[model samples]
Target: KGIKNLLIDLGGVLINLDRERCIENFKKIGFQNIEEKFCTHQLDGIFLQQEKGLITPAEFRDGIREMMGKMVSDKQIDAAWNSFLVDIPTYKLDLLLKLREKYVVYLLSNTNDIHWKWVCKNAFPYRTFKVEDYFEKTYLSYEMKMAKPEPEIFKAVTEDAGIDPKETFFIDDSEINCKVAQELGISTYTPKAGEDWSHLFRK
Candidate 1:
């Protein structure tokens, strides 16, 4: 079988993330050294641990406040962190609906509670469809306690989905992640610079 399942990535692939906006917001909350600490391809320090579910949302906020050496409310921290999420285009949702008719589409995202919560509550309602409506199951890094580019995470998802690596197509914006999936014998696609995802499988 060829491409029986599709393992899709969130953030840069399905939704736009404004990391610079997030960094700027963090600066507004007194974190002056944010740009040096974060990147779109990878995150370090507290954010990385947060994504791995190694810390709670409150703990993550407190850690940031500590790093900033200033008092900041949880709401302020959450607002800054969530500023990274821009939008989930309607076309992608439409494409997912179409794809689900032919393939088992599943979501695989390296995201934590705060970010996912905001997306589910604030973003999806506009699409008028819950996250579960598009995919068979969502594999979140926070829930799984693992993230992409890690062979173990990929292996775990395939096992849980009962999918054959050879028949799976993993799409991600990050090259490193796509490379890892390729190593696992799963076909992969990385949309080229400025490419629109909806055109990926169009006739």
Candidate 2:
């Protein structure tokens, strides 16, 4: 009768991320002033457009090259951008399996094609579930054209999934994202970045 749905964020929660490492790789790859253009809190320009699924993956790779004003190859572009993803610890993967046993687990993330494809292939599993088996639904910003901190994304998720916000328990790393969910009557917890707070949930 309570907390029937469990909504979760992918990065900084289920999987580990290292923006510093990603930036350093971009620096080595000759992405000038990469730091100045980097802001995970608020994405803009090509990055923002890509997350909204406005452009194709090829377009994004080309967009980076255009921004760089260079002739970077597709593989090189993916290598540099993919460095942002660290890895999904086995414990976190195990936790996902556990949570699914009791709640209708759903993944909601502001992600792009390049990164999410990597995640779906590498982050979840290679056996027993085929990665897709873990969640009832995955609300992605790129696919939905609605990202977090925007009330529309949350609204769209609740409506499409047919889940009541009051009966859902959500967790994300961004305090701002949690605030938006809170306004919509969804219970939320903003886990500290890179820490194992799976202790918060126990069946």
What tens-digit string does per-residue lDDT give for candidate 2 at 1-203? 38999999998887789888887887787887667655533236788888889888999988778767789889998999888898888887777888888889999999999999888777776456656777898899999987888999999999999999999988998999999999999999989988898878754
Give the Å error, residue 48, model 1: 1.2
TM match of model 1 to true structure: 0.92
CA RMSD for every model? 2.5, 2.3
**For residue 90, what is the lDDT in candidate 1?**
78
Write model 1 residue lDDT over 1-203, tens digit each, in one string.
57899998888887788878988999998988766545532347687799999999888888888778889898899999899999888777888888998899999999999999998887666456887788999999999999888999999999999999999999898999999999999999997634577766876
lDDT of 2 at 111: 90
State the TM-score for model 2: 0.93
| Poorly placed runs, candidate 1 (over 4 Å) | 36-43
State the lDDT at 83 in candidate 2.
84
Q: Could you estimate the TM-score for every candidate?
A: 0.92, 0.93
Backbone clashes under 3 angstroms, per model: 0, 0
